[PDB]
Structures are given as structure tokens and as C-alpha cells.
Amino acid sequence: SAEHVLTMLNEHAAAFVRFEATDAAGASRSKSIPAQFFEKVIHARGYLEDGEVNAGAAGAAASDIVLMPELSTAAVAAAAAAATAAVICDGGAAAAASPRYIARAALAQLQAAGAAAGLLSAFIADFCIFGVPEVINSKTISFPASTTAAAADQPQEAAAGGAAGAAAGAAGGAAAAGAAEICFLPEAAGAAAADNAFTLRTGLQEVARRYNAIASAAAAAAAAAAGAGSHSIWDVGAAGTNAFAGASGARATLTGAKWLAGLLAAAAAAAAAAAAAAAAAAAAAAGAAAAAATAWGAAAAACALNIAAAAAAKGAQIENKAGAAAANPYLVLAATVAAGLDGIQSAGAAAGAAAADAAAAAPSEIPGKMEDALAALEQDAECLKAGLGEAFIRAAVAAAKYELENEETDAEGNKFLEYFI
Amino acid sequence: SAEHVLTMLNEHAAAFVRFEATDAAGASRSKSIPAQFFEKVIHARGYLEDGEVNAGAAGAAASDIVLMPELSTAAVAAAAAAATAAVICDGGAAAAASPRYIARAALAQLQAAGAAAGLLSAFIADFCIFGVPEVINSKTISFPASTTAAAADQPQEAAAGGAAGAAAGAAGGAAAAGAAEICFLPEAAGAAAADNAFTLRTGLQEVARRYNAIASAAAAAAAAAAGAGSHSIWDVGAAGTNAFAGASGARATLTGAKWLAGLLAAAAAAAAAAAAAAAAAAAAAAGAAAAAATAWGAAAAACALNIAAAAAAKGAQIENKAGAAAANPYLVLAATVAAGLDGIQSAGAAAGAAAADAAAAAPSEIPGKMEDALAALEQDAECLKAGLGEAFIRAAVAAAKYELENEETDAEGNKFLEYFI
Numbered sequence: 001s002a003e004h005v006l007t008m009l010n011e012h013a014a015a016f017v018r019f020e021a022t023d024a025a026g027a028s029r030s031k032s033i034p035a036q037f038f039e040k041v042i043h044a045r046g047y048l049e050d051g052e053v054n055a056g057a058a059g060a061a062a063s064d065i066v067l068m069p070e071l072s073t074a075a076v077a078a079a080a081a082a083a084t085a086a087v088i089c090d091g092g093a094a095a096a097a098s099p100r101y102i103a104r105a106a107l108a109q110l111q112a113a114g115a116a117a118g119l120l121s122a123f124i125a126d127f128c129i130f131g132v133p134e135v136i137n138s139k140t141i142s143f144p145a146s147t148t149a150a151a152a153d154q155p156q157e158a159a160a161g162g163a164a165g166a167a168a169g170a171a172g173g174a175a176a177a178g179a180a181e182i183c184f185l186p187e188a189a190g191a192a193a194a195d196n197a198f199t200l201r202t203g204l205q206e207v208a209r210r211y212n213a214i215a216s217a218a219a220a221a222a223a224a225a226a227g228a229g230s231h232s233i234w235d236v237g238a239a240g241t242n243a244f245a246g247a248s249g250a251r252a253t254l255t256g257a258k259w260l261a262g263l264l265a266a267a268a269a270a271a272a273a274a275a276a277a278a279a280a281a282a283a284a285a286a287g288a289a290a291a292a293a294t295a296w297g298a299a300a301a302a303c304a305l306n307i308a309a310a311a312a313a314k315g316a317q318i319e320n321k322a323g324a325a326a327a328n329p330y331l332v333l334a335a336t337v338a339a340g341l342d343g344i345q346s347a348g349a350a351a352g353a354a355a356a357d358a359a360a361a362a363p364s365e366i367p368g369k370m371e372d373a374l375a376a377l378e379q380d381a382e383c384l385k386a387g388l389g390e391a392f393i394r395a396a397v398a399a400a401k402y403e404l405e406n407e408e409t410d411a412e413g414n415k416f417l418e419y420f421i
Numbered sequence: 422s423a424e425h426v427l428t429m430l431n432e433h434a435a436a437f438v439r440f441e442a443t444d445a446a447g448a449s450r451s452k453s454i455p456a457q458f459f460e461k462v463i464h465a466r467g468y469l470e471d472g473e474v475n476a477g478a479a480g481a482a483a484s485d486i487v488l489m490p491e492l493s494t495a496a497v498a499a500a501a502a503a504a505t506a507a508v509i510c511d512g513g514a515a516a517a518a519s520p521r522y523i524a525r526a527a528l529a530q531l532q533a534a535g536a537a538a539g540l541l542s543a544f545i546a547d548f549c550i551f552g553v554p555e556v557i558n559s560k561t562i563s564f565p566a567s568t569t570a571a572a573a574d575q576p577q578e579a580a581a582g583g584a585a586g587a588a589a590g591a592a593g594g595a596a597a598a599g600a601a602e603i604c605f606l607p608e609a610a611g612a613a614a615a616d617n618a619f620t621l622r623t624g625l626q627e628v629a630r631r632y633n634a635i636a637s638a639a640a641a642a643a644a645a646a647a648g649a650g651s652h653s654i655w656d657v658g659a660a661g662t663n664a665f666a667g668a669s670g671a672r673a674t675l676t677g678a679k680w681l682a683g684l685l686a687a688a689a690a691a692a693a694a695a696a697a698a699a700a701a702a703a704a705a706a707a708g709a710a711a712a713a714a715t716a717w718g719a720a721a722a723a724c725a726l727n728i729a730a731a732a733a734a735k736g737a738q739i740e741n742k743a744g745a746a747a748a749n750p751y752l753v754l755a756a757t758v759a760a761g762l763d764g765i766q767s768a769g770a771a772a773g774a775a776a777a778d779a780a781a782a783a784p785s786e787i788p789g790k791m792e793d794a795l796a797a798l799e800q801d802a803e804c805l806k807a808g809l810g811e812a813f814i815r816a817a818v819a820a821a822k823y824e825l826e827n828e829e830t831d832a833e834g835n836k837f838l839e840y841f842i
Contacts, residue, residue, distance in 0.1 A: 124471065158555030162567065165554075165637035166626055169446070171476040177439055177453020185455030226474055231484075288824025289473040289481055301473060301820060302481020319484075358481050358823045 002043045005074045008085060009035045012076050018086040019047070019067055020198070022099050024056070026276060026328030028198040031067075035085070043071060046092070051396070056097060059399025065093045073195065075187075079206045088195060096392040099330035103194055105388055106337040110236075115255075115344055116243055119337065120235035120317075123193035125325050126228045127180075127204055128221040130214050146221070148213075170225055182207065193232070197329035219275075219324030220282040227283045228325040229291070230274070233308050234259075234336070235317040245316040249353050250298035250307035252316065260296050260305055260318065260350040262343020263336065264362060266383040267294040267304065267322055268373060270339060273331040274323025283324045288358070291321035295362045297354035305350075338386040346382070423464045426495045429506060430456045433497050439507040440468070440488055441619070443520050445477070447697060447749030449619040452488075456506070464492060467513070472817070477518060480820025486514045494616065496608075500627045509616060517813040520751035524615055526809055527758040531657075536676075536765055537664055540758065541656035541738075544614035546746050547649045548601075548625055549642040551635050567642070569634075591646055603628065614653070618750035640696075640745030641703040648704045649746040650712070651695070654729050655680075655757070656738040666737040670774050671719035671728035673737065681717050681726055681739065681771040683764020684757065685783060687804040688715040688725065688743055689794060691760060694752040695744025704745045709779070712742035716783045718775035726771075759807040767803070 008014065018032045046068035051058025058065050069087045077086040091098035110116055133146040147154065155167045168175070179185055183203030189196050204215040220227045236243040236259070246253025252260075263270070275281060284292045295303040296318075306319035323332060351362050367373075377384060429435065439453045467489035472479025479486050490508045498507040512519035531537055554567040568575065576588045589596070600606055604624030610617050625636040641648045657664040657680070667674025673681075684691070696702060705713045716724040717739075727740035744753060772783050788794075798805060 126474075156556035156558060156565075158553050158566070159635070161553065161630070161633045162551035162569070162635040163554035163556070163637075164626055164630065164635050165639070166448075166623075171474075172444065172446075173450070174475045174478070175442070175450025175452060177437070177451060179454040179458070181437060181453075181455055185457055188457065231471065286824065286828060288821035289476070290824065291481065293481070297482055300482020301479055301484040306482075306484060321484075354482060358820060 002040070002071050005071050005087070006038065008074055008076075009038065012085065013083045014076075014085045015082055016084045018077055018084065019069055020086055020088045021067065021091060022198060022328070022330060024097060024099065024328065024331075026326070026331070028202060030086075032084075042069070046089075055400050056393065056396050057091075057095075058396055061399075062093075062395075065091065065095065068092050075199075078182075079203075079210075088198070094392045096388055096390055097396070099328060099334075100194070102388065103330040103334045106334045106341070106386075109341055109387060110337065113341065115341070116236045117238035118236075119192070120237050120242070121192045121232060121333075122190075123197070123230065123232045125193070125200075125217075125230040125232075126226070127325060128216045128218055128228055129208060130216065131212075133214065133216075180204065192333065193329050194333050217325035219277065219279040219326045221279075227279075229283065229321070230323045230325045230327055230332070231291075231319070231321045233317050233319050234340075236340075242314050242316060244318065245313040250309045250316075251313065252307050252318070255344060256318065257350050258344045258347060259340035260343070261348035262339040262341070262346070262383045263305055263320070264294055264296070264350055265343070265348065265365075265380065266335070266339035268365065269377065269384045270322060270332075270335045273335045274327050276328060277324075277326040280324035280326045290359075293354075293359040293363055294322070294365065295354040295359075296350050300354040300356070300358065302358040303354045307353075339383045341386060342380075342383045346380070423461070423492050426492050426508070427459065429495055429497075430459065433506065434504045435497075435506045436503055437505045439498055439505065440490055441507055441509045442488065442512060443619060443749070443751060445518060445520065445749065445752075447747070447752070449623060451507075453505075463490070467510075476821050477814065477817050478512075478516075479817055482820075483514075483816075486512065486516065489513050496620075499603075500624075500631075509619070515813045517809055517811055518817070520749060520755075521615070523809065524751040524755045527755045527762070527807075530762060530808060531758065534762065536762070537657045538659035539657075540613070541658050541663070542613045542653060542754075543611075544618070544651065544653045546614070546621075546638075546651040546653075547647070548746060549637045549639055549649055550629060551637065552633075554635065554637075601625065613754065614750050615754050638746035640698065640700040640747045642700075648700075650704065650742070651744045651746045651748055651753070652712075652740070652742045654738050654740050655761075657761075663735050663737060665739065666734040671730045671737075672734065673728050673739070676765060677739065678771050679765045679768060680761035681764070682769035683760040683762070683767070683804045684726055684741070685715055685717070685771055686764070686769065686786075686801065687756070687760035689786065690798065690805045691743060691753075691756045694756045695748050697749060698745075698747040701745035701747045711780075714775075714780040714784055715743070715786065716775040716780075717771050721775040721777070721779065723779040724775045728774075760804045762807060763801075763804045767801070 009017075014035045016032050017035050017038065018030050020028060020030045022028050046066040048064055048066055050063045051065040052060065052063055068090045070089065074085055074087050077084040088100070090101045092101070095101065107119070110119060130146045130148050135144045136142075149164070150168045150173060152167055152169050155163055155165060157163065183189075183199040184196070201217065208215040217228050219229070236255075244253060244256040244259070245251060246256065248254065248257060275284060284290065290302060291304055293302050293304055296305040296307065297303045298307045298309055304320065304322045306321070308315070308317040308319045310316055320336065354361055430438075435456045437453050438456050438459065439451050441449060441451045443449050467487040469485055469487055471484045472486040473481065473484055489511045491510065495506055495508050498505040509521070511522045513522070516522065528540070531540060551567045551569050556565045557563075570585070571589045571594060573588055573590050576584055576586060578584065604620040605617070622638065629636040638649050640650070657676075665674060665677040665680070666672060667677065669675065669678060696705060705711065711723060712725055714723050714725055717726040717728065718724045719728045719730055725741065725743045727742070729736070729738040729740045731737055741757065775782055
């Protein structure tokens with residue numbers, strides 16, 4: 001409803017409006033203008049901008065690209081110092097580097113294949129909080145550091161009125177409140193971590209800053225302790241009903257086992273979005289509560305693909321663990337679905353459920369070389385990177401590459417002369 | 422009453438609610454969500470969470486455990502910066518590491534044995550207060566330090582308007598107010614230090630912080646002075662009457678003497694909860710007012726198990742001293758009862774009352790070796806660690822042990838090669 005977005009500007013006396021998007025790495029970004037600019041044309045043509053400001057979105061002969069706001073997603077920007085609103089956007093011209101538009105192609109493919117009509121997932125991702133982080137690097141030193149009032153290191157230190165004597169312990173601080181709070185509760189938001197992830201990611205920081213603290217999503221923010229995992233639950237449906245419920249193990253079904261077979265096969269490549277930083281590889285390292293074990297079950301807690309068993313058949317779902325909060329939400333939402341969408345077409349199987357010791361059966365996969373990982377990427381190849389291009393990416397990246405190669409070929413020309421002398 | 426907890430959210434306009442619990446060491450912990458989530462389902466199913474956040478509550482194949490709030494225990498969280506409420510919980514799945522649920526088993530055993538119908542105890546525990554504590558350790562130094570406006574060290578020091586000249590002395594500061602205050606007085610709370618201990622432990626800190634100070638429960642917070650003891654009074658009843666009143670010494674009775682016999686025998690193991698830190702062992706060290714003398718009486722003030730003599734027979738009770746505020750309240754409440762519950766079944770006796778010099782008669786027990794302490798633990802053994810398991814503990818701890826043993830066996834494998842060269 002264009003009419004609803006226009007009446008919200010009067011209903012909340014909005015002086016300005018914020019356009020919002022997300023990059024390929026996984027961070028949200030925004031821009032803003034006075035509310036007076038909003039008219040019928042932008043509801044059909046968006047906002048034209050110069051894309052040369054971003055090294056992978058345009059080129060010098062094509063310095064015009066479009067942000068495209070939407071008319072079912074507007075909200076009051078209540079954390080601001082003034083009466084304002086916010087609106088998430090797709091990006092276009094084109095285009096095929098906008099993560100939200102890439103995620104929408106997986107939803108279109110789910111419907112076009114006739115396998116179902118929608119997807120019913122949700123997330124339970126963790127985060128970290130601090131008072132004085134300090135992280136720097138140079139030609140002579142490199143160190144991270146951080147602290148918080150709850151930290152197990154503080155009760156030995158002095159303070160302006162003495163220590164509280166009430167700090168947490170190592171893996172011993174499971175006493176925090178919820179739902180952490182105002183970016184889900186007043187909206188009663190409920191839906192999947194596509195659009196909803198970024199109001200949470202900005203909200204955690206903005207609320208902490210308004211309480212003289214900060215928040216982060218660093219997957220391994222401290223050693224010898226817990227970290228910011230991004231565990232989730234996953235489900236499929238059509239005509240108003242669940243499609244993973246049935247009479248196989250832990251109340252799952254055969255199409256659920258085929259989605260699991262796709263997820264198990266794709267785990268080595270889904271990690272490129274779900275574990276997009278070295279901190280997530282550190283969080284996935286060996287330990288008594290790790291989640292790198294690419295297996296399924298309903299009791300082996302370390303296995304990456306639990307079954308969410310329930311008394312009501314409508315609540316029979318799966319539970320994915322193969323990632324951390326350093327990830328890109330839209331690209332995780334795309335990649336985990338792309339695996340399931342072809343597991344149902346290969347008709348593969350998840351093998352037997354894990355109920356032994358914490359790791360093995362399946363794990364497997366597996367061959368132990370980069371050459372075999374590339375061979376898998378070129379044989380299946382169908383649970384992985386499914387559909388689209390990439391034409392927009394190579395067009396924008398070519399403009400940057402031509403400038404870089406012109407500087408590098410002149411530098412190589414000088415270097416060759418400096419080798420012939 | 423589920424209805425009463427729901428109407429409190431309207432009556433006090435609560436925006437959020439705080440779930441609360443306690444760990445095995447003895448510290449309270451909490452989490453929170455918006456009040457809008459409260460519905461009929463959580464009153465019968467609690468809140469599911471990932472237990473891998475705590476190294477002794479779940480495992481990777483069983484990453485689902487339940488917090489279980491209650492519907493007779495809700496209160497307004499009046500110390501908060503907003504309109505909110507708080508609710509203590511049990512924990513389950515399972516389970517048998519939740520201290521409050523472990524304490525409830527002793528109350529169930531008291532009733533199931535037919536010995537009585539309830540327990541009528543209370544506590545008088547001490548605490549400490551400071552302005553600038555400083556405590557740190559490294560590879561090169563180790564030191565504690567602290568101070569407060571009342572301390573005997575301050576009257577020789579300068580201040581921004583000169584010294585007050587009104588500090589206390591060593592063992593000479595018995596002039597503090599009571600009931601210390603707002604976590605007992607406005608509730609008229611009265612009942613035993615099971616549920617009531619943690620509102621006091623958080624309240625002392627929160628009130629001190631709101632007066633630019635801090636509070637603590639360190640049993641031996643400073644040398645050559647008093648410390649944070651956790652002395653208590655104990656009683657038993659059924660059909661509306663006291664069951665320790667009678668015609669033996671100091672108006673006690675024979676079942677009271679059998680409870681005392683159990684307590685005297687169990688003292689060497691009840692200390693594992695009542696003196697859970699090295700500061701409590703330091704508080705129990707030799708001196709003119711120590712409480713380590715495992716004996717009973719009504720005049721020998723150092724004896725660990727006084728009789729609370731009274732003019733009214735309803736007030737004839739006992740008084741236990743064998744602990745300090747570093748303890749875990751729920752596990753002390755369990756262990757001290759577990760001793761009494763089998764003293765009445767062995768039909769043992771407390772020997773004669775102490776009225777001589779400050780220590781001896783009984784003390785005794787006693788054999789002077791760890792082998793004999795272990796022999797006692799394997800012969801009685803019935804006043805000690807009575808009932809339950811522990812199945813939940815070993816299940817969660819096994820998941821942690823498998824990760825630890827996988828890292829340690831690889832390290833030992835490398836170490837063996839480094840010994841064979």
C-alpha cells in the first residue's frame with residue numbers, strides 16, 4: 001500500500017525518511033532525505049544514484065543505478081533524535097549483487113518447482129556486549145582487548161565505589177534477560193531472519209549505546225568461553241500446512257530427509273555464507289559443545305542438523321547449527337534453501353540418525369583435499385550456487401579491474417626493466 | 422494462580438519480565454523478555470533454550486532444556502530503570518543439577534517418611550560493604566585490597582573536606598542498622614532462606630550501588646576482624662505445632678537430639694555446601710569466637726549447634742553455626758535436612774551438652790585421615806548425600822568430557838613421541 005506509507009508520514013509527523021540495504025559481506029547500510037520528496041513516481045521508479053561510490057555496483061560509463069524502497073515494510077525510526085521513518089529497499093538496474101533480491105530468487109524457485117508454496121524458518125542467534133573494546137595493528141604490534149561489568153576478570157580490580165562482587169564465570173553466565181527486546185516485541189515480528197535480522201543487528205548496538213555500552217556479533221569474541229553462534233530452525237509448507245511432519249525418525253518425513261541430504265552435501269560450501277570470517281572457523285574448532293559435525297539426529301546435541309521434535313505435528317521441524325553471527329543473513333537464507341531445493345531432485349538420503357558419541361556417523365562426507373572440494377563444486381554443483389548470475393557483478397568489477405590492471409601493468413613494466421639491468 | 426501473575430502485568434504496567442535461577446556454586450542468574458509473550462502454554466511447558474551455553478546442563482545431541490517459572494512467586498522488579506517484574510524458576514528436561522529442585526526433594530522426603538509435614542527454619546547471615554575494592558593476579562604479582570568510610574585505617578588519611586574522625590575499630594563496629602532492608606520489610610517475608618536468600622543477596626548489592634558503594638558475602642573479607650558468617654535457626658512441625666519442643670536439656674526433645682546426632686555426624690560433609698570456599702575455611706580457623714567446634718549446648722557460645730531456648734514452648738528450636746555466606750543457600754537447606762532425616766532412623770545420640778571451656782566434649786567425631794573420612798562417606802553414607810542422582814549431571818558432563826579427552830589424548834600422543842626421542 002503506497003497510501004499507507006504516505007499516511008504514516010502524517011500519523012507520526014515524520015520530517016525525514018531512511019532508505020536501508022545490506023552489502024555482500026553481511027552489514028546493513030543506509031541513506032536519508034526529507035519526507036517532502038515522497039510522490040507517486042518513486043513508487044514505480046525508485047531513486048537513481050551514482051554507483052561509482054561502491055567498487056562493485058557500477059562503472060564510469062554506467063554511473064546510474066536504482067535503490068527501490070517498498071510499501072509493506074515501513075516503520076517509525078524511534079531510536080532517532082527526531083520524528084523520522086525507515087524503509088528497506090531492493091537494488092536494481094539490473095541487478096544481481098543485492099543480497100535481498102538474490103534471496104527472493106530462492107523463494108521464487110521454491111514456488112516455480114511446485115515442491116511447496118512457502119518456507120517457515122526462524123533464528124535464535126547469540127551476541128556479545130562490552131564497555132571498553134580496544135583492537136589495533138601496526139608494523140610493530142598487533143592485539144585485541146575488551147571488558148564488561150559481568151566479566152570473570154573484573155572482581156580482582158578496584159572501582160570508584162569498590163567492586164560489586166557479582167561477576168559471571170567462564171562458561172558460567174547463562175542468566176541474561178530476553179527477548180533483547182524492542183526490535184521484536186512491540187512489532188510481534190515472528191517471521192524469518194531475512195528482513196528481521198537487520199533491525200535486530202542495529203537494535204542491539206543502538207540500545208547498548210543508549211545505556212553507555214556496545215554490542216557485537218563476533219563469533220569467537222573471547223577465548224576459553226562461549227561465542228556468537230547463529231543457530232536456526234527450518235520448515236516448508238503449502239495450502240496452510242507443514243511439509244516436514246510425518247512418520248520417519250523424530251516425527252520427520254521423506255522430503256525432510258531429502259532436504260537434510262541436500263544440507264549435509266552442501267555444508268562444505270554453505271559455510272562460505274554461514275561462517276564468513278576467521279572468528280566463525282575458530283568458533284567451529286574442536287571442543288565438547290562444537291557444531292562442525294555435519295550429521296542429523298534428536299539427542300546427539302553436537303550434530304549440525306537436529307530434528308525439532310514436538311507433540312503437535314505442525315511443530316515437527318529441523319534445527320541447523322553450522323554457522324555464526326559474523327554471517328550474511330540474506331545469503332545464508334538463500335544458500336541453505338538452495339541445498340534443500342535440489343536434495344528433493346537428486347532424491348539423496350541423510351543416512352542413519354546420530355545417537356552414539358558426540359561426532360562421527362555420518363562425518364564423512366568426505367575427501368581430504370582442495371582438488372576434491374573443487375571436483376565436488378563441479379559435479380554437484382546443483383545443491384550449490386543454484387541459478388542466477390553475476391552479470392551485474394562482472395560488469396561492475398570489470399570497470400574496477402581495468403583501472404587496477406592499468407596501474408599494475410605499468411608497475412610490472414618498470415619491474416621487468418629493474419630485473420633486466 | 423496463573424491469573425494473578427497475568428493481572429500483575431496490568432496492575433504494575435510491566436513492559437518486561439525477568440526469569441531467575443541459581444547455579445551449583447551458589448550465585449543467582451537471570452534472563453528477560455517483553456511481557457507480551459506470556460500465555461497459557463508457558464504455564465504448562467516453560468521456556469525451551471539451548472543448554473550448550475553452560476558446560477554442565479546439556480550436550481550437542483540434546484541442545485534443548487526447560488526453564489520452568491512459577492505462579493505464586495512473582496514480584497515487581499522495583500530496583501530497575503523501567504516498569505518490570507521478576508519470577509524465580511525451577512530447571513528441567515530432566516533435571517537434577519537445579520539447586521532449588523534438589524532442595525524440594527528433601528521437603529518431599531520429610532513428608533513421605535511421615536516424620537513431620539514441614540520445616541520452620543530461618544537465617545541471620547552477615548555481609549560486608551566497601552567503596553574501592555582492588556583484587557588482581559598475574560605471572561609476577563598477586564594481591565587483594567579494599568576500603569570503606571567506617572574502616573579503622575581511614576582516620577589517619579586526608580580527604581576533600583578533612584577526615585570525619587568517626588571511624589569504627591578492629592572488632593569494634595557493632596553499630597549498623599537493620600533489617601538492611603527493602604528485600605524483607607515491605608514483603609514481610611518471614612520464611613526460610615531457600616527462595617528468600619537471593620532477593621537479599623542481589624538487594625544488598627543493588628542498594629549499595631544506588632548509594633555509590635558495593636556489598637559482598639566474602640566469609641573472611643579482612644584479617645584481624647569479624648567476617649560474613651551464615652548462622653541459622655532450625656525447627657520441624659506437623660498439624661500446626663513445633664516438634665523440637667519437650668522436656669530434655671534447654672527445653673529440647675528426643676527427636677531434636679536425634680536431628681542433632683545426624684547434624685554432628687554430617688558436619689564434616691555439610692561443610693562442602695556451608696563452607697564452599699577457602700575464605701570460609703579461614704573464617705573457621707582457631708580463635709576466641711570461632712564456630713568449628715561440632716558440639717551442642719545452651720551457654721558454650723563457640724559450639725556449632727546451640728539450643729534456641731524460649732519461654733514459649735512453640736519457640737524451642739536449635740541454632741546452627743557451621744557455615745559462611747560464600748555458601749549455596751538451596752544446597753545448605755538440602756544437606757542440613759538430609760543429616761536430620763536419617764539421625765531419626767539410625768536413632769543416634771548427640772552425647773552430653775557442652776558447658777565447659779570453649780571447645781571439646783563432643784569434639785571428637787573423629788579420625789585424623791582422608792582414608793577414614795572416605796570410610797565414613799562409605800559407611801554413613803545415609804546422613805550424607807541422601808537420595809537422587811546425578812543422571813542429568815553425568816549426561817551433560819560426559820558431552821564436555823568427550824571434547825576435553827579428544828584434545829587431551831592428541832596432546833598425550835604428541836607428548837609420548839617427545840619422550841621416546
